[PDB]
Design a protein around this nucleic acid. Structure first.
Lengths: 52, 135, 51, 211, 116, 49
RNA sequence: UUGAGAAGCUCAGACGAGUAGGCAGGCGUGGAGGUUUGUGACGAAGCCUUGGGCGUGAGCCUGGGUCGAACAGCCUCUAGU
RNA sequence: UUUCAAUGGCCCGUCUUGAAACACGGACCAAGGAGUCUAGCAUCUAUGCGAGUGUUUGGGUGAUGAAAACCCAUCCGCGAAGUGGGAACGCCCUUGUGGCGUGCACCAUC
């Protein structure tokens, strides 16, 4: 914790160093896509690989 | 570098493109289509927008910003020249360390583009903004 | 964003102890194979003798 | 009742800490909100670490049955803090742990109705629901808290009537059962939430007075 | 001709070994002599304070150290520098006085004839 | 009539003469801002620590 | 219906000369980091062959013979390729 | 694989030239054999941070190679110095249609 610090608190052993932040908070894209918040407003999915 | 996939090798940027690929085709929103297009754009085409521009644009003319989230596919830098920061809710790819601290301590919140997709999957009540490309 | 809170400390005989340590925030940092292998490529060149 | 023991890496320690915490919650003292918020950080991770479906069905039952054990004065704070920690950590869960936490929220949804019925034996039902409707309105159904996920509220709407009927199998008395949803649908700044909650909710106006 | 810096880490090691070599010979006294505090001679830098070459004779006289004693206890003397203001004099007189407080001077054996 | 080269070098030198203090004040003011822009403790962070 | 290397899978239509030049993806060589809990005196590498196979191709795999001590696939790095 | 039959098939590269004609180079095989390194500049992309940014002149340090990695004192360089159309969004309500607002980037008008 002193070598690397935290994403909000500076590292003790590295002057003015903070841990990098992420472009996504939660990196489980399946959890976002298959969530109740998102799946409740998507239109009815067409079929998978369609018949010829 | 801008057409069908980002030129970026960032794994987490690919996870956002994957999330908004689903949102663009499974919803009839132009916000999800616009956000997806701006994820393919390069760093030159995604200029930073200052914390002062967000405050100015929301409380502009009639103001009445209410609580609409400000969305930018880019970095929200800080403007140390402005001294009082309003209560803002911004969703961006990246915030600088000073901008994130100023937004949080001065009222509101900072979000990522995946935290906003769960709050406004269709991008309703969002203020989509851009940075000036004049540079 | 949710990870295991603590980790167990093991003794010399491989037995668990009652003590635990909160997981440091470095294990919650982004994992960037593109960035790691770009920095490694440069650092691996920094002990090369000239020919 | 140590929180660090509640989130231990071995299930035997977590079960022992859960049993010790059963007495700690029944003291005749007022716990502040922060004390319960820290307590619910360990309890969330006690549930977060449950492994098999049969254990996490019983574990969620144990946590729900903990509510009547708490002192009546700070029992509302116990539920209000549960829904605060289930809103700030909901989006951080992964897709393989949502089903185990859906059941916990469902068990606590019915734990509120069951506590309403218990207090209705002595006190009048109108004020008991009013105390709970204040908890719902100040917490999950707050309109000024934009960051509270809709997944929790969509789940609550789906199970509100079905878990109220479980508590009152014979008949459901008149009360403001669906007050939090009425306040949310009317005056929420989430257009996705208010356009979809009436579809998810199945409120029965059979008993509530016509407006 | 192209100068290359492959001996850059070998010069770093060689210079550090000289400091260790010097410290071995002079075991408890500092590896450097105390330097004065001066101000750089331009309108761009006169606000900064940096280290000088040696202390002036007027600074040593006020501190109580003679110019012959000074060199023997690690205090350099700059016969060229002068004190055009009282702040430079007092800034470096205090610097000498603090140095004398923290200094232990080991006694020397003295030749002493029988009589006379 | 216009100026003389005696002061022209003095004017340009006086222009860059303030470069040191401007950099020192800019660095000094930045650290004051970082001291003010400290995110609070979030007391739910020492719960397991 | 299992067909989510979502960098995958799938449906449909049109189209196909090409110098200079523009662009993309691949084949091969020496050495380096990692890996294959890799191959080898029960035979590595190399070479030979009207043996067999794979790829539109660069090339690759393999049988037999010869041979005698080392060598390769994959991700990345590098160049006297 | 060899060989036969039927049909077809002008010697390759270079230069020339509409084109060829040409004139050149070529007895055969093996091995070697030609856009490299570096300094500066500009565009573009990626990466880090962002009104900042750049550790490696140097110092500290590094016991398992210590020319690596790790750390940063003082400087310094480069930067800082109203009306229309319109992306996107909400609300409707004859509901689609359109209208009412809010209007980024950028372009026109003061």
């Amino acid at each position: 914790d002193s070598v690397f610090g935290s994403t909000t608190e500076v590292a003790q052993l590295k002057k003015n160093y903070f841990l990098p932040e992420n472009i996504i908070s939660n990196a489980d894209v399946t959890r976002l896509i298959n969530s109740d918040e998102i799946q409740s407003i998507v239109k009815a999915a067409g079929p998978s690989r369609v018949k010829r | 570098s801008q057409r069908s996939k980002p030129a970026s090798e960032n794994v987490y940027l690919k996870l956002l493109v994957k999330l908004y690929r689903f949102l663009a085709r499974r919803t009839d929103s132009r916000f999800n289509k616009a956000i997806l297009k701006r994820l393919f754009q390069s760093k030159t085409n995604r200029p930073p927008i200052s914390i002062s521009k967000i405050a100015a644009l929301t409380s502009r003319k009639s103001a009445s910003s209410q609580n609409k989230t400000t969305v930018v596919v880019g970095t929200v830098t800080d403007d140390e020249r402005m001294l009082t920061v309003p209560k803002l809710s911004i969703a961006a790819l990246r915030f600088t360390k000073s901008a994130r601290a100023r937004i949080l301590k001065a009222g509101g919140e900072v979000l990522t583009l995946d935290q906003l997709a769960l709050r406004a999957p269709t991008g309703s009540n969002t203020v989509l903004v851009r940075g000036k490309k004049h540079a | 964003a949710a990870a295991r809170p603590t980790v167990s400390i093991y003794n010399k005989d491989g037995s668990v102890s009652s003590e635990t340590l909160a997981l440091p925030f470095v294990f919650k940092a982004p994992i960037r194979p593109d960035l790691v292998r770009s920095v490694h490529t440069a650092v691996a060149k920094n002990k090369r003798q000239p020919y | 009742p140590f929180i660090k023991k509640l989130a231990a890496n071995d299930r035997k320690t977590r079960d022992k800490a859960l049993e010790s915490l059963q007495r700690f919650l029944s003291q005749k003292k007022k716990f502040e909100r922060l004390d319960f918020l820290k307590l619910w950080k360990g309890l969330f991770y006690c549930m977060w670490m449950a492994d098999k479906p049969l254990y996490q069905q019983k574990l969620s039952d144990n946590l729900a049955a903990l509510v009547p054990i708490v002192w009546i004065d700070n029992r509302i704070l116990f539920q209000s803090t549960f829904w605060e920690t289930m809103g700030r950590e909901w989006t951080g869960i992964d897709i393989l742990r949502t089903d185990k936490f859906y059941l916990l929220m469902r068990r606590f949804c019915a734990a509120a109705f069951r506590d309403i019925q218990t207090r209705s034996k002595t006190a009048l039902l109108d004020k008991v629901v009013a105390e709970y409707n204040q908890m719902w309105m100040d917490g999950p159904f707050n309109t000024e808290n934009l960051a509270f996920p809709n997944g929790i509220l969509f789940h609550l709407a789906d199970i509100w009537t079905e878990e109220l009927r479980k508590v009152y199998p014979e008949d459901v008395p008149k009360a403001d059962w669906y007050l939090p949803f009425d306040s949310t649908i009317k005056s929420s700044h989430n257009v996705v939430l208010r356009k979809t909650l009436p579809k998810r909710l199945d409120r029965v106006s059979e008993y509530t007075k016509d407006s | 001709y192209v100068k290359t810096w492959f001996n850059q880490p070998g010069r770093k090691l060689r210079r550090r070994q000289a400091r260790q070599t010097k410290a071995a010979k002079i075991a408890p006294r500092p590896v450097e002599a105390i330097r004065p505090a001066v101000k750089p001679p331009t309108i761009r830098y006169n606000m900064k304070v940096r280290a000088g070459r040696g202390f002036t004779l007027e600074e040593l006289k006020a501190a109580g150290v003679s110019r012959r004693v000074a060199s023997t206890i690690g205090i350099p003397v700059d016969h060229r520098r002068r004190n055009r203001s009282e702040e430079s004099l007092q800034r470096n007189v205090e610097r000498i006085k603090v140095y004398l407080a923290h200094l232990i001077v080991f006694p020397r054996k003295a030749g002493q004839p029988k009589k006379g | 009539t216009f100026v003389s080269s005696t002061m022209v070098r003095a004017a340009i030198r006086n222009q860059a003469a303030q470069r040191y203090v401007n950099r020192q004040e800019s660095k000094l003011e930045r650290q004051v801002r970082a001291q003010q822009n400290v995110i609070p403790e979030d007391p739910l962070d020492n719960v397991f620590a």
